[model samples]
Target: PRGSHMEVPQPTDLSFVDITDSSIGLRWTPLNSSTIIGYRITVVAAGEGIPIFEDFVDSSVGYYTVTGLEPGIDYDISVYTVKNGGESTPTTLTQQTAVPPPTDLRFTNIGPDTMRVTWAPPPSIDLTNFLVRYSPVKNEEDVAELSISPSDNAVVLTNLLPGTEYVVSVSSVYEQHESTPLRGRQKT
Candidate 1:
């Protein structure tokens, strides 16, 4: 191996600057820039081969932020030390993005003892399943919950008490975790 083009040491203390449902900010300690060109960073979902985010930052930059990621997903990030047009050892880390809730929840087709609840699902790459929960505000103990498929965006709650106010919520489910639910109140 050529002396001036050999692999450099891996970066250290890999950490997060910020994390959200769709973005991740990263920071790390880079090696001395005496013979370095830049750092090539990449992000990929766990168990996947291709990277969803990748870029080369200048030698002076020690941080990068990647966007357009899926919510409630685990990702693997690799920071490679680049020198002489070659990637040296890589520093790696893993993080799970926050889950995202549904949007624009509303009630339609109201009836005396039944009503339709609908909402826009979160932009997700996973199964997109949802958990719908509702209860009469006056008697929270009489709760009802159901799991619906990704294809179905609306559900009707029947057997509800008439002339009563009910609290409803819709949450996106992934694995064992659920997002913050979109909540609303309706009268039936």
Candidate 2:
């Protein structure tokens, strides 16, 4: 046994336990090998050239949160076991950050049966589109929805009941996820 060189064991069972608009929590099964010193965490944005985060953590810790990531962006995560002289193979995972909610949702040009809706876009540029949904306050089940380009922040709604209050909300759409709705109110 003394003649053979020790090999560091790679981290296993790696998974994302928490995700937010700008962060992800990573968890993995810590190796029990005495030859390993700690774990090395590396993260890079998808399709990016450089790693945004690279660090080493104590072997006693099994979870780490990678922060300051961009909203609605996918990232590549790698966890490796570190030894004194070398590192083990990486345990890789792919995860996407959550999308940010729309901001400053408001209604303008209110009329008898028409109104204009506008909102400020989320900080994330990776959003694919925005979902505009509105419904009469009295009848929440009756709703109307539409999708608008992320580049255009304004949309006009027509053929609404006069003198009625409506609950208007907007949310950002990313790859396969939708952000929390930004709610507002208006009367037509």
Candidate 3:
């Protein structure tokens, strides 16, 4: 078959390193045979399954920055070389954003049949909200869930089975990631 005389170029050393809680720095060695004019970097959010950011950098520019990401989430990155108006096969990588350890989980008395739950947000989290789950300690099948504002430290759970012991747990959700479950208990 008649074809253009384009040679397959070997990909160079692709590397990525963490920069901060929500950012990463990436770099790669230039492919030797191709007259690479520039490079492109793309990032995809965890489980979104699509690239959310894409940009080009000069061939001479060996490094690029990825930013505005959620802490505690894992991301996929692909780097490609641009030459002669064509993009090379992508070199793939992965990274997990930093998240501070969980803290301040507790339950407070709200009434004879209700309790208020509170927690301190993880310092490194850019969370959207929290998930609070409660169930009677004896009957695991009886469970309830609540969503609260990100800035809120407390939420009231009412209309409980009086004199029954319950187990409560909280988890912070940020984008596609969730924190470790924080557990507490109380008698309603």
Candidate 4:
């Protein structure tokens, strides 16, 4: 309290950038951090001493996100203001996490030459599209991919090897973020 450092001001208009099953959107008015460990942000689950999450960032108004939130829970969040060597009052709020990943992923054998891959949309509002990525189970590690109509919930892969096993995965895309995939195997 004896240096040229000034008291940090309250961050206004705090809110999420856009949350998905595994991530939380975080943002606020600009601030700067001059400390070695960065700004300290905390997410406390209601009625718990241990915070659900803690974040450190350069003090400033900006876009930041917290990842790995468990689905189906509520949280009390705090974003602190920090600069040089002092801490400001934090802005606090309550947030509920988004729904978990799609659980109905499956493959249907339609014929020797094609198969149907069907899935349900996640409950997130930011879902922009879905990705259908598949390859032979033998070489599932590498493949080019394509997109489906954001409105379409199913995709039929043509020119498949008859009665052959393949590895496939479905990913929900939300505002440039990709949810962890739901995976399966199919035979055409």
| lDDT per residue (tens digit) for residues 1-188 in model 2 | 32356666788899984344466888899875685678989888898586578877887888888777766567889998887646777999988766777788878856789999988887646678998889999998999999999898889999999889999988898875788899998888
For each candidate, what TM-score against the reference? 0.62, 0.61, 0.52, 0.51
Cα lDDT, model 1, residue 62: 93
Q: Could you tell me the TM-score of candidate 4?
A: 0.51
Of candidate 3, the 10-residue stretch with the lowest lDDT total is 1-10
Per-residue CA lDDT of model 4 for 78-155, tens digit only, reads 876665566677788887664444558777788887888888877644457777788887777765476876677788
Superposed by TM-score, candidate 2 places the C-alpha of residue 140 at a distance from the truth, in angstroms, of 14
lDDT of 3 by residue, 50-93 (tens): 55888788878877988767676677888887775777677888
RMSD of 3: 6.5
TM-score quality measure for candidate 2? 0.61
Give the root-mean-square deviation of each candidate in angstroms: 5.0, 5.0, 6.5, 11.6
What's the lDDT for residue 128 in model 4? 70
Candidate 2, superposed: residue stretches over 4 Å from native: 1-3, 17-21, 102-130, 133-157, 161-169, 173-188
Clashes of each: 0, 0, 0, 9
Candidate 3, position 23, lDDT: 62
The local distance difference test score of each candidate is 0.81, 0.82, 0.75, 0.69
Better of 2 and 4 by TM-score: 2
Sort order, lDDT high to low = 2, 1, 3, 4
Query: Clashing residue pairs in candidate 1, if any?
Result: none
TM-score comparison, 1 vs 4, better candidate: 1
- Cα miss at 180, model 4 (Å)? 0.5
